[PDB]
Design a protein around this ligand. Structure first.
Ligand SMILES: [Ca+2]
Ligand SMILES: [Ca+2]
Ligand SMILES: [Ca+2]
Ligand SMILES: [Ca+2]
Lengths: 146, 28
């Protein structure tokens, strides 16, 4: 139940990715723009569905308290395998089952915290168990569970 | 539910991975 100041800051940083204009609410339009920047192409009906599921009052947008309520509860879910696969799909935008340095760099630039190109190479190398220069799904699961 | 919630939580998990990586690398 207990949330730390650091956990709240982490959830705030996740919220700020979707609130493109920084005005305090996530709109359906912003959600679509961010999803497409992460290589996905949701339908307008899917976008409206996602807003409605998080929007606790009726006003049609997501504010941070609504976002935090959903994320703090998700922190107590046990389906870790499904969440890690969703993260894998964010990186693996071409769906070939392997994350390249270029795919990692692309996600990095969209999500905020900057990594140098040397750090991108290092992150790939340290997860690349079999040494083909890319991160497959089973390597990614081990990376994300450490 | 898990489909919608999962997209938002996935970006958190990725941001956390990057943040922990950078913090550990620069640990004094
Ligand atoms: Ca906004
Ligand atoms: Ca609302
Ligand atoms: Ca790929
Ligand atoms: Ca590999």
């Amino acid at each position: 139940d207990q949330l730390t100041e650091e956990q709240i800051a982490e959830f705030k940083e996740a919220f700020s990715l979707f609130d493109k204009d920084g005005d305090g609410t996530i709109t359906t339009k912003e959600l679509g723009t961010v999803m497409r920047s992460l290589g996905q192409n949701p339908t307008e009906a899917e976008l409206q569905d996602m807003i409605i599921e998080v929007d606790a009052d009726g006003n049609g947008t997501i504010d941070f308290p609504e976002f935090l309520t959903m994320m703090a509860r998700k922190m107590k879910d046990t389906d870790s395998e499904e969440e890690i696969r969703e993260a894998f799909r964010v990186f693996d935008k071409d769906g070939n089952g392997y994350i390249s340095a270029a795919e990692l760099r692309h996600v990095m630039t969209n999500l905020g915290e900057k990594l140098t190109d040397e750090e991108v190479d290092e992150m790939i190398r340290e997860a690349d168990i079999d040494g083909d220069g890319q991160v497959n799904y089973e390597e990614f699961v081990q990376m994300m569970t450490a | 539910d898990e489909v919608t919630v999962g997209k938002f939580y996935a970006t958190f998990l990725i941001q956390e991975y990057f943040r922990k990586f950078k913090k550990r690398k620069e640990q004094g």
